[PDB]
């Protein structure tokens, strides 16, 4: 008798960066997915392991919501068994993932004529991320035989890069807001159920 706060995840003013992707926990509520259905035609709406039509008839223990902003031609990397800069260094989904991925264009909100440099992503790491793992460190990355002791220079680079969204870019370089829902069911009693 509480209703789940889906509109706070989707209608939020500010979305987080890729390398800090803002997990939220939802439990002990009635989940109404009609609001997700009625939303304007999405650039992507894919579910894994569960049919989209069979929501509102399933019960789960917890529902996690992760939100971040990526560019247009990186949306295809938010999927099980995918490889790329975003999948390897920023956000990794398990191969046996059960959930849904929603993405929509946000050019009117996250783009500035001079350039929006508030969104960053990681472009350097020694090893690939495990599923559902975050890395917010800002240490200098070593690519040579000589250490740099925290000073940038040759063969020593900062591991983060900005997007610089501008309104005149093409669809493949425009901002996109992505929400991934992870459905977890365990031996505990169910807490999230549909109407």
């Amino acid at each position: 008798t509480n209703l789940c706060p889906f509109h706070e995840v989707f209608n939020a003013t500010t979305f987080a960066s890729v390398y800090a992707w803002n997990r939220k926990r939802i439990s002990n509520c009635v989940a109404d997915y009609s609001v997700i259905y009625n939303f304007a035609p999405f650039f992507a709406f894919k579910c894994y392991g569960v049919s989209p039509t069979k929501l509102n008839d399933l019960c789960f223990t917890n529902v996690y919501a992760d939100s971040f902003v990526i560019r247009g031609n990186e949306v295809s990397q938010i999927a099980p068994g995918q490889t790329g800069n975003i999948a390897d260094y920023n956000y990794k989904l398990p191969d046996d993932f059960t959930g849904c991925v929603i993405a929509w264009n946000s050019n009117k909100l996250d783009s500035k004529p001079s350039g929006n440099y508030n969104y960053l992503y990681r472009l350097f790491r020694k090893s690939k991320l495990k599923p559902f793992e975050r890395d917010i460190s800002t240490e200098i990355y070593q690519a040579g035989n000589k250490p740099c002791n925290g000073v940038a220079g040759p063969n020593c680079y900062s591991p983060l890069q900005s997007y610089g969204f501008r309104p005149t870019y093409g669809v493949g370089h425009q901002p996109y807001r992505v929400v991934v829902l992870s459905f977890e069911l365990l031996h505990a009693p169910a807490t999230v159920c549909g109407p």
Epitope: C47, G49, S51, T53, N56, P80
Partner: antibody, heavy 119, light 108 residues
């Protein structure tokens, strides 16, 4: 028993429009999902549309923006409105009923089929 | 999308033999696999769902096994009404469901 009957196929000029229908019997129509699947010799079976029980519609990234699916629970009928018909839309169309057993989804009943010739 | 492959493309068998069809996926999909049978000029019919579950009314000859990226359909005895085309379908990624090319079973 559970029977599905299609109707509305024929020849149509390229760039035209046609409507397909499928009437259900033997089961509670409003409690099930319905889908359209096409079959051509070039590419075999292909899914083209899906409608749920809560006014939700799904399309693939090959015909979206051209086709529209609708449901009339009172008359137990399913419709598919097709616009901007290219030459690659020539195939045999079935209306299929969706069902699930747990988290697993499958198509359990199919219709006889209707043929659309766009040439 | 996920590409599904089947082997052999064509199989020729006699009555009473044991036949085996295979399906391969381009990505791990677990048990989310379905099997269909289509006779010439008729509608497809569901045989196996969840890669191992027999649909109600299907004869006990048909069995299914596998998980991950390799799947198998087996007919213990081949009665004369089992010459058709068999398709494998994946249900892990929705709503974009994909089918296999199909395997045809002839009579020798």
């Amino acid at each position: 028993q559970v029977q599905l009957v299609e109707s509305g196929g024929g020849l149509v000029q390229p760039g035209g429009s046609l409507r397909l229908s499928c009437a259900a019997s033997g089961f509670t129509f409003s409690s099930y999902d319905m889908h359209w699947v096409r079959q051509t010799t070039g590419k075999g079976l292909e899914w083209v549309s899906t409608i749920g029980t809560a006014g939700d519609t799904y399309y693939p990234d090959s015909v979206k923006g051209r086709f529209t699916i609708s449901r009339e629970d009172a008359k137990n009928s399913l419709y598919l409105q097709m616009n901007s018909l290219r030459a690659g839309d020539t195939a045999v169309y079935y209306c299929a009923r969706g069902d699930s057993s747990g988290y697993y989804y499958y198509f359990d009943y199919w219709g006889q089929g209707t043929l659309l010739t766009v040439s | 999308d996920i590409q599904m492959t089947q082997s052999p493309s064509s199989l020729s068998a006699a009555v009473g033999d044991r036949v085996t069809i295979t399906c391969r996926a381009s990505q791990s999909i677990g048990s989310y696999l379905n099997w269909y049978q289509q006779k010439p000029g008729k509608a497809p019919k569901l045989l196996i769902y969840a890669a191992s579950s027999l649909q109600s009314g299907v004869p006990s000859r048909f069995s299914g096994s596998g998980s991950g990226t390799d799947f198998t359909l087996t007919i213990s005895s081949l009665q004369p009404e089992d010459f058709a085309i068999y398709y494998c379908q994946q249900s892990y990624v929705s709503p974009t469901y994909t089918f296999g090319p199909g395997t045809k079973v002839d009579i020798k």
